[PDB]
Amino acid sequence: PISKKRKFINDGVFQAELNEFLARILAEDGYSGVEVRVTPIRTEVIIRATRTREVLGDKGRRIRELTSLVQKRFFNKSTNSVELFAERVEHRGLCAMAQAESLRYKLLKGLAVRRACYGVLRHIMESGAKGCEVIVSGKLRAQRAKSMKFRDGYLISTGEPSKRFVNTATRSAQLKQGVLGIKVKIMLPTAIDTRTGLTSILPDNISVLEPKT
Amino acid sequence: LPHHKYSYIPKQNKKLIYEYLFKEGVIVVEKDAKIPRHPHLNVPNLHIMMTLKSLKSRNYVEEKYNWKHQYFILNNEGIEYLREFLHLPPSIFPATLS
Amino acid sequence: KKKKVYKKPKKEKHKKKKVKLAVLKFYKVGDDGKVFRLKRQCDNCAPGTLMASHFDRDYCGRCHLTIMKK
Amino acid sequence: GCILNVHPKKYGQGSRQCRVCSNKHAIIRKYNINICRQCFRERADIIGFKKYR
Amino acid sequence: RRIRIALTSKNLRAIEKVCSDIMKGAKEKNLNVSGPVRLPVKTLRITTRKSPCGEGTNTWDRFELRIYKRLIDLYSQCEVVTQMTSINIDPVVEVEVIITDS
RNA sequence: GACUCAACACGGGGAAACUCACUAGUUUAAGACAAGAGUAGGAUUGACAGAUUAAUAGCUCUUUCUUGAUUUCUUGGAUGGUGAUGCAUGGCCGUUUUUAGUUCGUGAAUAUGAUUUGUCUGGUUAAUUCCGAUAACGAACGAGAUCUUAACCUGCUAAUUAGCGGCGAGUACACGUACUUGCUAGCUUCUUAGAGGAACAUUGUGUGUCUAACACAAGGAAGUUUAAGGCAACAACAGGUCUGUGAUGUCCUUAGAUGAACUAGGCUGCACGCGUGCUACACUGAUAUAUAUAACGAGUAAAAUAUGCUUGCAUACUUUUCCUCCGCCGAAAGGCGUAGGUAAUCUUUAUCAAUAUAUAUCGUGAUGGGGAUAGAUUAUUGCAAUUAUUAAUCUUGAACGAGGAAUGCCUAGUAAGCAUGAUUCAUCAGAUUGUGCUGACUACGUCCCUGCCCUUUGUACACA
Ligand SMILES: [Mg+2]
Ligand SMILES: [Mg+2]
Ligand SMILES: [Mg+2]
Ligand SMILES: [Mg+2]
Ligand SMILES: [Mg+2]
Ligand SMILES: [Mg+2]
Ligand SMILES: [Mg+2]
Ligand SMILES: [Mg+2]
Ligand SMILES: [Mg+2]
Ligand SMILES: [Mg+2]
Ligand SMILES: [Mg+2]
Ligand SMILES: [Mg+2]
Ligand SMILES: [Mg+2]
Ligand SMILES: [Mg+2]
Ligand SMILES: [Mg+2]
Ligand SMILES: [Zn+2]
């Protein structure tokens, strides 16, 4: 019978640890998030990824193993109260985690940096994205480290809108001679629900309507 | 009970760990050698750590580590080796495969 | 920081001296006067757990029960 | 006998550690978080804390 | 039969919407419902330092986690209220039912 | 480790053990896997007693039982490391800079070029913020907007774990007032918390190209964008961190270990130099009594209390471990017994402080100012208090009489004075980070010193 404060802290910590575990397991599957619905009857986890087929396994064999591991780690006392479900991301051109994982996977095969960056740029922008930015930092060719930036369109930096309308991720790739950092930023096509949830637009516009004639 | 040295795994402890791994499919191990016993298994934690370390070197499990835990998973060769070791009929399968 | 200074040689480890077929010294049987125990048997250990015949006592190597000779 | 790990460690800095790193410095003990300060500053958003002012 | 409904949540939108839905759903059955009671909001604070290392100007940041709570009373049956409660709520709000007959 | 701002109560760094990285010793294998050896006629494991060790480490020796293929020896090969390298890297943070800056399309300067203009003489603003002039016409980031808290609402929506009111019974007074108590019409002022509204320089008067704007008065809760914060462009630094990390490249080391531990010690050692501070030098005070009065917070696998047995075992995880009202004991610190509370419900807050206020004593005297340094006794945390953990009582009673050359912060509920909650925490704040209480003087400016920026100008500087 612990107090409310400790209950909420416990939920936060469990959320974080589960997310980190799943992000490690499903690296090569475009992992993008987790949702947990804790009932005292059963707890249901809902994974979001791009490649649902190879997440599921052969007749769902892999997802059964994932369920067993998650249960033995977090719900040790009981026996069968947890189940998992996989879902596919509707528009993968606006999920920053997916793009960052794709760039990492490309760069691990030895492909040139510039081609991969222009490719991901062209892929994000054709999904309607209003702006985008990709940054790669480290020993690129020489022994002295460097950064490279690649931009397109329109992007915001300050204020409260920049936290609503922008999607961000960071990843790293272990090359033979060091580590490279990957940093992706996507501004969503004027699509952001509000804190008092409703589809908003932009805190910077004053269109004036045309009189009826 | 002649009180051997700690970390001198008897045959029974290894048999119990193999039985659990075969029946269940997977195992979580909690890397800490100072714990007295495993949640599902009445054996010193160090013994489970040592056995699972030994299986990975021979490519019978795959493991990967999230902060403070191990998360082992059995191969197909693991299944075959455990049938040969434990003498089970060629019909039995671990619970994950159903 | 510096390399060690070793003036005293190493402490040596403990080896266990070996006796070949020591069990044949524990029981011996004549033609008459059949098998006769040469060491003595324990008290709370399953039968056949013999104990050492020391200079002044008897010692069970399995439970460490000591009985003083007198 | 054995003298391995026999010193009493019920209280003090040597008793508890980070839930993630296993380090033993600058642990948050308020509300029983039990994470050192660096990892917490990295994970605070998904835990539930926010920056307002 | 003096049933009390209690709601706690981290999100203001979520719990406000759930309270509105329960309030309107119970009024379609012509039930004596006591208006929601909004208890004081409670805030959890952590003030940690930036800068993994120890050099530079000493700056801090202030973190906040605040908790909301609502409260509804009504005269009805246990089965009716436990059906009305559960319609697959947005699972970010906690709901618990208690009988305050004393 | 870090050494001008931008090192020096910083590394959340208040170290008795642990932490720990340093000094002196002693153990351990928790040396994957592969190949060879060794071996059931036994590979190896453990240990009473005497010696021996700080040691109840069979560590080692004497002695001689136990154990059963788990291990042991050789060569490879992995693993770990608060070991080196922040001048090999990731991430994060600090600083330039919280300034007002940065870029692009087409046109023009070209009739070579690096490159210009757009991005400006002037007025105006907190602001490349605007007006306007114009070989330029248009756009984008930054500024602004946005977000969080504070200030107004007898109007809306609500009543518990909030109040007020209504109905009775009393205890005393004055001919209704104060308090105690059982019960429970209605209402939202006080308390709480959701949705809205309200300021636009509105109106009047003046200055200005009468543009952009500024100043004063009236009204108003509010007229320095009303107050405070959070966010933070392009480009950089060989700035800090590998001692936060199962982030990591290379080099070392790997059984007499630079791995992991156990015992004691050191990080605190004192002719001296420097930074941040606490207490003072008294009467606008010290001591002693009494009266009145805040805001933001926090709080529950081990050891511990009870039968059969010779300091150990088997036993309830039935009590207890966090804040602790109340009763009793004790000068005091504290001790013993028992409630409530996983919390708008109890601790505890129609009040958990101290500056204040009232009355008396002292009386310009290093003094009843100041309280360092020492002696003795008593409690509590802890396995352990010696180099004195902290707290309690009596005794002792140093410098200091307003601080030289220099130098810091600050414009209103602000400076200063006054206390308090949390972080660390078994025990310890003279430190940080928040909160409230009492509440001034002086300006309403300028480019003189210091720093930063722009224009013209000179340059033999470009690691500038
Ligand atoms: Mg960088
Ligand atoms: Mg702004
Ligand atoms: Mg100390
Ligand atoms: Mg390391
Ligand atoms: Mg550097
Ligand atoms: Mg760096
Ligand atoms: Mg120019
Ligand atoms: Mg009101
Ligand atoms: Mg590191
Ligand atoms: Mg030590
Ligand atoms: Mg020091
Ligand atoms: Mg005196
Ligand atoms: Mg005095
Ligand atoms: Mg400190
Ligand atoms: Mg000047
Ligand atoms: Zn950590």
Side-chain angles (χ1 to χ4, degrees), chain A residues 1-189 191 193-213, chain B, chain C residues 1-69, chain D, chain E:
Chain A
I2 64 175
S3 44
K4 299 287 100 174
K5 294 179 181 177
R6 276 205 266 155
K7 193 255 174 187
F8 276 86
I9 297 283
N10 282 30
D11 303 343
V13 167
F14 158 62
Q15 183 62 255
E17 184 174 353
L18 198 172
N19 186 5
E20 194 146 344
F21 168 64
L22 261 177
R24 284 195 189 192
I25 300 297
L26 311 183
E28 290 295 322
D29 304 325
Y31 165 77
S32 162
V34 174
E35 178 190 331
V36 183
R37 309 175 177 170
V38 176
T39 64
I41 309 163
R42 283 185 287 97
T43 311
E44 293 179 354
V45 180
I46 292 165
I47 292 176
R48 287 176 280 159
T50 61
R51 287 188 292 275
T52 61
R53 179 183 292 110
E54 286 304 311
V55 168
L56 271 176
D58 187 80
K59 296 183 290 294
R61 186 191 173 189
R62 204 189 183 199
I63 203 163
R64 272 176 266 136
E65 288 161 0
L66 288 170
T67 306
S68 304
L69 280 187
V70 165
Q71 180 178 180
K72 292 171 172 66
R73 171 57 184 106
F74 297 105
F75 307 88
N76 221 325
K77 258 64 183 169
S78 185
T79 176
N80 75 308
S81 65
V82 179
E83 69 268 25
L84 309 202
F85 306 90
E87 302 299 326
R88 183 175 292 171
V89 177
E90 64 265 12
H91 318 300
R92 62 164 179 168
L94 316 186
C95 181
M97 293 177 70
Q99 313 293 321
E101 285 299 331
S102 177
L103 191 41
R104 178 187 152 205
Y105 180 73
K106 283 173 184 182
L107 263 170
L108 283 172
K109 299 189 208 75
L111 209 53
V113 188
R114 293 197 76 93
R115 196 166 188 184
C117 282
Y118 291 166
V120 182
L121 271 168
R122 187 195 316 140
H123 191 41
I124 290 174
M125 213 78 207
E126 293 170 5
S127 290
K130 209 161 167 173
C132 170
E133 170 156 287
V134 184
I135 299 170
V136 176
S137 308
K139 305 172 182 196
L140 284 158
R141 285 186 293 178
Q143 203 190 12
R144 191 149 175 185
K146 196 173 193 163
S147 303
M148 296 183 159
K149 307 192 181 182
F150 305 80
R151 306 172 155 115
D152 208 295
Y154 177 41
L155 205 81
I156 294 170
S157 304
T158 62
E160 199 260 340
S162 81
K163 184 215 292 181
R164 268 185 200 167
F165 298 76
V166 183
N167 203 5
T168 300
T170 54
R171 295 290 189 262
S172 61
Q174 169 170 4
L175 265 294
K176 186 183 173 179
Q177 274 150 340
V179 183
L180 285 178
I182 303 155
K183 200 164 290 181
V184 183
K185 288 193 188 163
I186 297 182
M187 185 179 288
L188 295 174
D193 99 294
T194 312
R195 260 42 195 166
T196 81
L198 289 175
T199 181
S200 274
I201 304 103
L202 177 63
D204 308 271
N205 289 337
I206 23 251
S207 48
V208 181
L209 309 193
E210 184 53 40
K212 190 261 287 184
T213 188
Chain B
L1 195 156
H3 174 246
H4 294 105
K5 71 194 276 203
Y6 183 76
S7 80
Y8 204 61
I9 308 96
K11 303 292 182 181
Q12 285 78 14
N13 283 356
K14 172 158 68 179
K15 201 169 185 173
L16 270 176
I17 284 146
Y18 278 7
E19 287 167 12
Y20 182 86
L21 184 48
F22 197 52
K23 173 170 74 71
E24 191 69 27
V26 297
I27 187 159
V28 189
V29 184
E30 181 65 26
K31 177 193 275 202
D32 195 351
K34 288 156 56 61
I35 282 179
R37 58 88 174 173
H38 189 271
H40 284 289
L41 194 59
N42 196 2
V43 160
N45 202 269
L46 171 62
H47 295 181
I48 301 164
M49 281 150 69
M50 287 174 65
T51 291
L52 266 296
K53 180 164 173 168
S54 194
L55 283 181
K56 173 178 69 178
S57 283
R58 293 181 281 175
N59 283 108
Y60 292 151
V61 293
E62 52 271 35
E63 61 86 20
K64 59 198 298 182
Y65 180 104
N66 190 43
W67 48 266
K68 293 295 199 41
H69 283 76
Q70 289 271 28
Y71 305 99
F72 294 94
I73 290 173
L74 201 75
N75 279 317
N76 272 340
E77 297 80 323
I79 302 184
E80 296 322 340
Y81 184 67
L82 293 196
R83 292 180 181 177
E84 181 205 86
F85 189 100
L86 282 160
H87 299 299
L88 274 74
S91 185
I92 193 66
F93 284 128
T96 52
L97 204 49
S98 310
Chain C
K1 182 62 66 68
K2 283 76 66 180
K3 183 265 290 180
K4 302 295 290 185
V5 176
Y6 280 148
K7 60 90 176 179
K8 181 66 66 187
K10 286 173 181 282
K11 180 64 68 68
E12 270 300 342
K13 208 85 190 305
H14 174 59
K15 300 304 175 180
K16 165 178 171 284
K17 273 161 75 175
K18 293 193 287 289
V19 191
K20 192 171 192 167
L21 277 153
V23 65
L24 305 175
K25 274 73 192 166
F26 283 24
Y27 305 98
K28 185 63 180 175
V29 64
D31 305 346
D32 297 345
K34 291 302 178 293
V35 65
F36 182 76
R37 279 92 189 162
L38 294 175
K39 320 268 173 200
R40 59 152 270 176
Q41 204 271 319
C42 180
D43 287 327
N44 63 7
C45 280
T49 304
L50 278 65
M51 65 183 73
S53 178
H54 276 284
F55 182 35
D56 63 358
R57 76 215 173 268
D58 280 27
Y59 168 59
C60 184
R62 195 171 188 273
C63 58
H64 327 301
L65 168 61
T66 297
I67 308 287
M68 272 315 300
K69 282 176 197 199
Chain D
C2 77
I3 60 171
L4 208 75
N5 314 114
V6 294
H7 193 65
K9 271 189 284 303
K10 292 85 150 174
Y11 60 71
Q13 184 178 2
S15 56
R16 72 280 191 190
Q17 78 195 309
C18 185
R19 201 200 294 245
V20 186
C21 316
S22 302
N23 194 51
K24 297 192 192 110
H25 295 272
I27 314 295
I28 309 298
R29 296 176 89 204
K30 184 167 193 190
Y31 313 125
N32 289 135
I33 307 288
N34 276 114
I35 312 168
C36 68
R37 64 177 177 103
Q38 291 87 356
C39 303
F40 179 90
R41 197 173 160 269
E42 293 179 353
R43 279 146 189 93
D45 192 74
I46 188 164
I47 285 159
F49 285 85
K50 298 293 183 182
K51 280 166 71 53
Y52 284 116
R53 56 169 179 85
Chain E
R1 298 285 74 78
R2 289 224 176 155
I3 300 159
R4 185 168 271 171
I5 294 158
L7 316 177
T8 61
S9 179
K10 276 164 54 189
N11 187 254
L12 195 54
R13 178 67 181 271
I15 191 167
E16 217 70 30
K17 182 64 70 177
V18 168
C19 176
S20 177
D21 292 319
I22 291 180
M23 185 64 72
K24 182 174 73 175
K27 182 62 65 68
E28 271 167 341
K29 288 174 190 123
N30 278 283
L31 263 64
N32 272 11
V33 296
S34 282
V37 178
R38 309 176 166 96
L39 299 177
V41 64
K42 50 162 73 173
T43 305
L44 285 68
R45 290 196 196 91
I46 291 285
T47 178
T48 183
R49 190 170 167 178
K50 310 195 212 209
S51 180
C53 79
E55 71 91 22
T57 299
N58 306 325
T59 52
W60 310 75
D61 46 8
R62 302 170 270 258
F63 285 120
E64 268 173 79
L65 198 171
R66 56 186 74 168
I67 308 163
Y68 308 97
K69 193 168 186 181
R70 307 295 179 255
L71 210 64
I72 301 147
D73 291 331
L74 80 174
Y75 287 34
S76 179
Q77 306 292 113
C78 280
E79 58 271 10
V80 173
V81 304
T82 187
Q83 192 290 347
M84 172 201 313
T85 298
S86 167
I87 62 170
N88 295 113
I89 298 89
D90 180 13
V92 67
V93 183
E94 183 178 1
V95 185
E96 65 183 1
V97 176
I98 62 170
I99 297 89
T100 184
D101 70 330
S102 63

